[PDB]
Each structure stands twice: as C-alpha cells, then as structure tokens.
Design a protein around this ligand. Sequence first.
Ligand SMILES: CN1CCN(C(=O)c2ccc(F)c(F)c2)CC1
Length: 284
Amino acid sequence: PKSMQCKVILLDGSEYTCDVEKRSRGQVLFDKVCEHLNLLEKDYFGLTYRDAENQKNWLDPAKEIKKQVRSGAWHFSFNVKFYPPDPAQLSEDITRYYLCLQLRDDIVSGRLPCSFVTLALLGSYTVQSELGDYDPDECGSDYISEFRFAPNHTKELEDKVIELHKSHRGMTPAEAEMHFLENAKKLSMYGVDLHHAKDSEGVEIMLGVCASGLLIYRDRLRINRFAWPKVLKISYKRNNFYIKIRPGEFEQFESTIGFKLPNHRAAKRLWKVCVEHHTFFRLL
Ligand SMILES: CN1CCN(C(=O)c2ccc(F)c(F)c2)CC1
C-alpha cells in the first residue's frame, strides 16, 4: 500500500508529520491529528490547505485528500472551523485551550480586530495561563513578552498586559483560558469568516459567515444580518452567489439576494462554508 507524507501546522506553530494511504479521505488524516492533540471535541475543528490560487480551503473529510490538494503539496493547517458561541459549554478544557490558540492567531493576524484594552486583557490571560502568577524578577520596567498579542506591538501595550497580569494572581490555566474566551467571544468579528464580494450594483462588500448567520458589510454605516433560520436556499452559479430568504409574515414571495465573487472557485467556497455553518449551527 503506497503512503503519502502529510505535514500539518499545529496551532502552537509546530509541525506534525504522519503518513496516510495515498487514496485516504480527509477524515483519516484529521483523526490522526486529533489523536496527536488528545482532542475529543473534534466537531469544531478541521484542516485547511492552500489551492493552486493560494486560497485557504477546508479539507473535506468525506473526500480523497489527493482529489482536493490535486497538484499541490500535502501540507495542511489545523484550525477552528466552527467557533463555539458559548465556549463555557464545551465539555473539555483542552478544547478551550485549542480555541484560545486559534483566537491568538486571529488577533495577531488582524482577522479579529480588538480595542487596545481588550488586546491587553486577552494578552494578560494568555500570560497567566502560560507563565502563571506575575513575577517582578522576570518583568522590569523595560519588559517585552516573547508572546505575540497584537498585529502591532507598542511598549504601552506591553505595560498594560503586565498591569492586568498582576491582577490575576492565583488564577489557574483553565480559569485564565475561560476568561480569555468569555472576553474574545464578545468581539464583533469573533468567528466571522470574511469573503470579498460585489453587490448586484458592483459595489465592493464583504460577506461574513458565522454561527448567527450571514453578514453583509457595505461600509462603516449599515450592516445587514440574515440569521440562518431565515435562509432556505444557498446557491452558486458561475461567479455568483445567491441566498433564498424566507418570506416575512404576510409577504407572498421568498426573496433571492445575489453577489459577484472574484471567480467560480470563490463562489463555490463561500457556498460550501455557508451550507456547513447552516447545518452545524441550526441545532442552537
Ligand atoms: C456532526 N454534527 C453533530 C451534531 N451537531 C452538534 O451537536 C453541535 C455541536 C456544537 C454546536 F455548537 C452546534 F451548533 C451543533 C453538529 C455537528
């Protein structure tokens, strides 16, 4: 039986390497990574790969790996796919731990915008979990953490992390991680997967996919929201993406809203992530 080497970037930035039979489905590799991570609450997570256009794609666990990566390398990242709206209800601390690691990357990358004070507060809970109690011996007036907290670091931010870290004396790692998540879950872009698109006029918008529904970001003024219950059909055709909205009370007709994506692969990718979010979260 011929086997293909897989490299998976883990959320702490280390590499997991394993082999699978070359006709293996995505679930096979995912199960190996999840066993490596001692992770049981696996339904929130997935593997990503980069396609020949360098776009992030979810590895479909039901389909052959080779039919997804095609000409590309068998190189993956382990990621949160469905962000829990209420991380306190997850069964295991280790699940909360991986969710924190993902969110730390979402913050540092700028995918998850965050006020100065919330960057410092989240940073302070990370430091508490990772180093434990504040120690002045390691932290002088000139201290800069090895920990990445933000898309740009300033000394003011480093100082505020330390001031808040001092307040967390006695806090255990699982407790600090739960505080991290209770704060992160409130951020307007928490667990929002953003897609560039054009409205049926030609105006550049962003489409956001998350637990609560589909978001349309036109600009700083006027954000549209379609809760998943209010969506009966999602479809794509060529470069276009459409959603079938349920009629409101006493309306005769459903209403269909349409968007232009960069290319056909982008429209298909947005359709699939919407269907998957809809299916996963219509049990809330
Ligand atoms: C494979 N299915 C199993 C059933 N299912 C859930 O139990 C579920 C878990 C957590 C959630 F937040 C949620 F919205 C739903 C979705 C995935």
